[PDB]
Amino acid sequence: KTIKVTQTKSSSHRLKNHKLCLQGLGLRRIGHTVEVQDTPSNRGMINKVYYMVSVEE
Amino acid sequence: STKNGRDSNPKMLGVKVYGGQTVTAGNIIVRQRGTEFHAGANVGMGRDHTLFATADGVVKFEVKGQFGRRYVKVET
RNA sequence: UAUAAUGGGUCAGCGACUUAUAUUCAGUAGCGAGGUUAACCGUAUAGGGGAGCCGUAGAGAAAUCGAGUCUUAAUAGGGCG
RNA sequence: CCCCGAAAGCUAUUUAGGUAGCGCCUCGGACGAAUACCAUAGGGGGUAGAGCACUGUUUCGGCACCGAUGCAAACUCCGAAUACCUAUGAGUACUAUCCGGGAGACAGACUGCGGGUGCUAACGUCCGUAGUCAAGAGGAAAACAAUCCAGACCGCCAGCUAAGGCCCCAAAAUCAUAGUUAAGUGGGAAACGAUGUGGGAAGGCAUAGACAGCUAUAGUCGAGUCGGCCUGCGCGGAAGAUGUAACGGGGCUAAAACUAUGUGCCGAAGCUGCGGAUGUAUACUUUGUAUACGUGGUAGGGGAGCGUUCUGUAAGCCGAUGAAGGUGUGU
RNA sequence: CGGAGGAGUACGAAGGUGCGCUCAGCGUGGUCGGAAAUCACGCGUAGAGUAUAAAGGCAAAAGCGCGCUUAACUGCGAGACCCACAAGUCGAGCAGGUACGAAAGUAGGUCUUAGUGAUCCGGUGGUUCUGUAUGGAAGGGCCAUCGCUCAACGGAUAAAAGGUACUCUGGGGAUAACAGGCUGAUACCGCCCAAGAGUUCAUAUCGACGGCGGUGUUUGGCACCUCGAUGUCGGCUCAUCUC
RNA sequence: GCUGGCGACCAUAGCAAGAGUGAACCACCUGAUCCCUUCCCGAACUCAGAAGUGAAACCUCUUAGCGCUGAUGGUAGUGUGGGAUUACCCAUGUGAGAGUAAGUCAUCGCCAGCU
């Protein structure tokens, strides 16, 4: 139902839509962890920034 | 010296309203130099081959006829 | 720009967004469909002085009309209100 | 002192280092979900690639056609990924939009990707696109705006990490396992040349005796031998002017080099811990208390203050039991 | 100051409408008449044409004829495209008058995209506007229209070429000449393959056609440093390094 | 079950080759008085009709002969992140064109007339 997403790298130099995906997931800094619903809409944002997040199911 | 160096101003042609969008009578749908698209139901043709809506509805693109022409129409 | 680009040998003193008028916007105070006097008079920051100005109606080049008016053969349509 | 924060573009200009409108910044007001990210659904294309059906161009055959075979920014029978437009939807976010006050700017630079130009030259020049600098400190790269990691409110002799590293200069493994190199290769370079050394696949001949040498195919001799292919790491090709000067240095060879795998650790102004300040919002239905999110900054915009001279308050208050000024100390 | 071409027009029909028609090429035959004129029949075929450059188009052909005609109208115009402004573009539909069709209908120039010039100042035709005491008039306004190779084409004036080594000021390393820097086309040096030359014999010595590098001397490219100054071609004196 | 008219669809549907049909319909056909027609022509268009024919044409059937359709798998390209710079490699997502196997001698709607 819900998964935990942790930000592992900086977002300062990433693409605009990638920063917007992090913001739309709710992550704010390196090491921040959020708990979000497991829906395809959220998973799209997660998969777009797969390279700087870590997911715990 | 060179004998080249000229060009004309842009003309901004192209599709203005895509399939599935809602239009109001008079809205321009396609700007085109020739008849790349042809006018279907509820679509009119201007003197410079512009395609425009003559009724309120939803735009639809299709291919029909013996010549395989591209048509655009407005469904009410 | 460490730059081998400019300026300064050092100290003390002086040295550069002002003033008048008009106008627009914001804040604040008085009065409020009204607000306000100018020159001037005045044992004079008072009190007088309503000429004038701004607001309260617009349309049209204008004559003209006026919550309408212009365009037009049109009461249609349309533009400014 | 606090908050926000650009641009070096488009269009026009006796214009090109000026200026104006628009784009980009800031402040006030109005209005709230109308906005964005992502997921589904609908849509057009003529690029990358490819192809020869048109237009050109090309080679070899056969009798302009026919058959095999190539090429194209201004060719197309075809044709993506992305990007762009629209609708619906979850979650997250002070998002979009409109009306006004004030601007600055209109010399850009480098790097990656797609290109024109140039010699597939230039730290060259002109566009598109993204990042950084500009206007941005910290750590790595010897030193090094534009590369990598990362965005500095203040304090701490606390902890964890990123890039990058762990023999000494100099913080952390002279750590573990298995191989390769002998060139200080590592720590600059090509066509080409060569029994350098690892690994792999296949082939030829051979104890009715193979290769080399030896004796004039026979003959002693008693195991492997011969020639290519693929691939890892090395060698030569390799000449310059102040002084080793092409690992930063010392030094390094079962490495302190290279390849693969695994345990730890060091490492930033990043993250966490403790203390303090400040801005915005939400609630307390006064507050000055809690929670959440912020506080790098040039040109600029906005907000809040400290001191100096003079006027009133002031015929007041302080002053020869010592004012202003000067010079130390403490707070 | 990249690669290639066009425009500064034309047409009262080459516009509107109703009706009608398909090109080009080739092969056969047929007087002059053939490569190619015109006639007849067939085969596969848009390869023709579209006033003009190219592109996008063109069977209800947008290509080609005939008859009648003036919609190459007047007042407008929902709604859009494009856009700094000024401008530019498409447009269903309403009213009046009209043309061609039996009619449903079609027509607000031409298949489209170039064929162009703001404002000021004046000229001409209209006009129920204005008219400096009053009635007129002059002049002005409104509607339609005329005069620019203002081509440096958003057009500074109605009206304008040169010299300065006799020179001067404000600026720029935003921008040239010297030297430095980046680069190495060019320059110089080296190597690979080897037809051939050398009485025979590529390699004693040379070495065609081609290929790969090095250096930073030359001629150059760029414009990064210096224009609030880095101030010289050669000679003299004195040198120091590379191979 | 055949014939005609009007559509849907626009090659798996078309082209080519062979074959078949005259009861009705259709087509060829007879004539040029009147309507109407030829930049000349009753060829076309038009009118008045039934002596002939299914020849031509149109329709229907058969054939994979040309054409058209066309997988699976692989290759090229490509968004994001990383590594390299003749421009490729890795992770992940996506994925042609050509060619190969193979398929195709269409499929439907309304009206009217015959047997």
Swiss-Prot record, chain A:
Q: GO cellular-component terms in the record?
A: cytosolic large ribosomal subunit
Q: Which domain of life is it from?
A: Bacteria
Q: Does the keyword RNA-binding apply?
A: no
Q: Name one GO molecular function term.
A: structural constituent of ribosome
Can you cite a GO biological process for this protein? translation
Disulfide-bonded cysteines = none
Keywords per UniProt: Ribonucleoprotein, Ribosomal protein
Q: Which InterPro entries match?
A: Ribo_uL30_ferredoxin-like_sf (IPR036919), Ribosomal_uL30_bac-type (IPR005996), Ribosomal_uL30_ferredoxin-like (IPR016082)
Q: Which family does it belong to?
A: Belongs to the universal ribosomal protein uL30 family.
How it assembles, according to the record, is: Part of the 50S ribosomal subunit.
What is the name listed in the Swiss-Prot or TrEMBL entry for this protein? Large ribosomal subunit protein uL30
Q: Highest lineage ranks of the organism?
A: Bacteria, Pseudomonadati, Pseudomonadota, Gammaproteobacteria, Moraxellales
- Name the gene for this chain: rpmD
From Swiss-Prot, chain B:
Q: Does the keyword Ribosomal protein apply?
A: yes
| Coiled coil start-end | none
Q: Write out the ranges of the annotated region (Disordered).
A: 1-12
An example of a GO molecular function for this protein is: structural constituent of ribosome
Task: Extract the PROSITE patterns matched here.
Answer: RIBOSOMAL_L27 (PS00831)
Q: Does the keyword Secreted apply?
A: no
Q: Which GO terms describe its cellular component?
A: cytosolic large ribosomal subunit
User: What Pfam family is a match, any one?
Assistant: Ribosomal_L27
In the record, biological process GO terms are:
translation
- Keywords, comma-separated and alphabetical: Ribonucleoprotein, Ribosomal protein
Identify its protein family.
Answer: Belongs to the bacterial ribosomal protein bL27 family.
Q: What is this protein called?
A: Large ribosomal subunit protein bL27
Question: To which species is this protein native?
Answer: Acinetobacter baumannii (strain AB0057)
Which gene does this sequence derive from? rpmA
